[PDB]
Amino acid sequence: KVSRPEGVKIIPPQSDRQKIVLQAHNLAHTGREATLLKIANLYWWPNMRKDVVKQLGRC
DNA sequence: GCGAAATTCCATGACACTACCTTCCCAGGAAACAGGTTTCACCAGCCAGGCCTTGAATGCAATTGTCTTACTAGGAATATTTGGACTTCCCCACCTACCATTCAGGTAACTTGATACAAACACAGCCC
Incomplete structure (x- = not known):
């Protein structure tokens, strides 16, 4: 968890790095x-x- | 102040209705085909003799062609009467267009199976 000046944002785990972006890329x-x-x-x-650049080279 | 990190920037390209068309390649295989050799058997070419069929000459008989007349029915004009093809308007069911699913058939293969052909000896039918 983390606080930002636009609201509350979420820090995901290190194991959840590739999964969370790939499900947002393919949307x-x-x-x-x-x-x-x-x-x-x-x-x-x-x-x-x-991590986003790490996605697109495989996509 | 350097570096790392978070951010804004901007130059650019592609979307505009799309498929065919041509010529060469590739390709594998196969299609036979065009090419060619090989051999054996058979079908075609050769020629003549005998006979039968065709052509011709003919006489004649009836068949057919022409002439003539009384006439029947065909055609046209009529009125009308009647029988319908197509134009019209509308709705529904049926065909289609589609994808997914599955089944069946065609190719293909290996085997099997069965029949037809080729050969030989004899029988029967028809003709000289």
Whole structure:
């Protein structure tokens, strides 16, 4: 759990890094930015964008 | 102040109704085919003799062709009478277009099975 100036956001576990982004990627098959703003509704953690790039090279 | 991290930036490309069409490739295999060799047996070509069929000449008989007349029915014009094809309007069921599912058939293979052909000896039918 974490607090942000736009509301309360959620820090997911380290085992739940690839699963939480891949289920947000495949919702609209977006790239780097519209993928990222989906995760900016529930989650937040340091280096979000290092994992989104980790997705798209396999997608 | 450097570095790490979180963020904004901006240059760009693709969407505009789409499939065919042509020529060469590839390809595997197969299709036979076009090419060619090989051999044996048979069908075609050769020629003549005898006979039968065709052609011709003919005389004649009835068949057929023409002429003539009394006439029957065909056609046309009529009125009408009657029998219907197509135009019309509307609705429903049936065919289609579709996907998923499954079954059946075609190819294919291995086996089997059964019949037809080829051969030989004899029988019967028809003809000289």
